[PDB]
Amino acid sequence: DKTVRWCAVSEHEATKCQSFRDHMKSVIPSDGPSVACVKKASYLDCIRAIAANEADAVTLDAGLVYDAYLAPNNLKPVVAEFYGSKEDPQTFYYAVAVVKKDSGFQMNQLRGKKSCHTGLGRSAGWNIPIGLLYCDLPEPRKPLEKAVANFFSGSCAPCADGTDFPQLCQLCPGCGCSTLNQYFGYSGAFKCLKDGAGDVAFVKHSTIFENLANKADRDQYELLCLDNTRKPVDEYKDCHLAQVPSHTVVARSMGGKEDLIWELLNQAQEHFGKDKSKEFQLFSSPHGKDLLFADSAHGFLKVPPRMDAKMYLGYEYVTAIRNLREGTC
Ligand SMILES: [Fe+3]
Structure with missing residues (x-):
């Protein structure tokens, strides 16, 4: 199956995700990438769900991407917004x-x-x-x-x-x-x-x-x-x-469908990306701001092969977080 199970946090995102699903069904060939929606109460529940193979993808803030990496989750960044x-x-x-x-x-x-x-x-x-x-x-x-x-x-x-x-x-x-x-x-x-x-x-x-x-x-x-x-x-x-x-959108480090996610989002931005369609907006919503993806985003870019979360986040920021938990005065 070529279905990416997107994890929607709450009612508003779930609504946008369904519109997303339907607008994709309308333009994408019957043999292409599909979006299914899984509803959760927080991004945290989405992290656990992806790790437990009950969902495939969620868009996380860089700081959250760090925690997504930590065990027992072991999630990894796959597609970044720009x-x-x-x-x-x-x-x-x-x-x-x-x-x-x-x-x-x-x-x-x-x-x-x-x-x-x-x-x-x-x-x-x-x-x-x-x-x-x-x-x-x-x-x-x-x-x-x-x-x-x-x-x-x-x-x-x-x-x-x-x-x-x-x-x-x-x-x-x-x-x-x-x-x-x-x-x-x-x-x-x-x-x-x-x-x-x-x-x-x-x-x-x-x-x-x-x-x-x-x-x-x-x-x-x-x-x-x-x-x-x-x-x-x-x-x-x-x-x-x-x-x-x-x-960045995160997925499992093993059997995470990272390429399907890219193929999905890459196709998603071509039809409904920034100023692309009057019908559906990937980067906005009548139901609220930043649902699924940030409204300030202009598109996506695939993250390099097996790029770790620490590698993605970089050294400066990864230490900034580390120093926050650890570190003294
Ligand atoms: Fe942020």
Whole structure:
């Protein structure tokens, strides 16, 4: 069978996945690649499901791709999304910290503030900011969730445990790990800042431009720079926390159908990719942002032969994560 079982996290993604399935059936030959949908409550459940041969693919943030690699899962990156433009595809993006205009605090003054993270263990939303603030956190720093909880004065860290670290869910009770949680994801962490729930939104450099069409609105927001100064939302090239690997679709390291996934996605972007069809959009949805794939994506590129997760992620980022768990002050 030439069916790729895509793992959809929750109702919204499941809806987009079915439209995906049907629009593919309509253009692809009866003997080509097919998409089936398997529904789960979180990406974590999708990881376990792929490893257990109950699903074949899921799109993970680079930080999550690291954890996907760790046993007993042993997942591996197979197809990466690319951003920017089709001419100059960027297999990376900038981790930023969006704040409102005149909130009066720098990076070295986040202590006691309310934060909005895209999700626990994610690049721009958790690994980068928390890695930088690691020493600023009060002892003891293990568990890390407890220290981040006591550092800030309430926040939203989707996928975090709210019974053990209740404050990491003060801004989004339960820390839902899917779009069911309005504060989940890039645009979820943004809504959290925009709606007034939090003081800072640890998102990516394109987040605000995806949510606010008019510049006048954007003028009421600022970025937190490394040198503890603020720069407008247009100057992320210089005002960002770090640069991170693009989101990537993962699959089993053995019998994972990596080539079918490529053949599927490669065909998917040709018919429904960026500005390709008015009927179906691989990179957008009426039901929400970033479903299955990020809205800021312009396409896919196959990851090299048997490329490990540590090899893919690279050395700098793979150490950044490592230092986060390990490391001292
Ligand atoms: Fe990300």
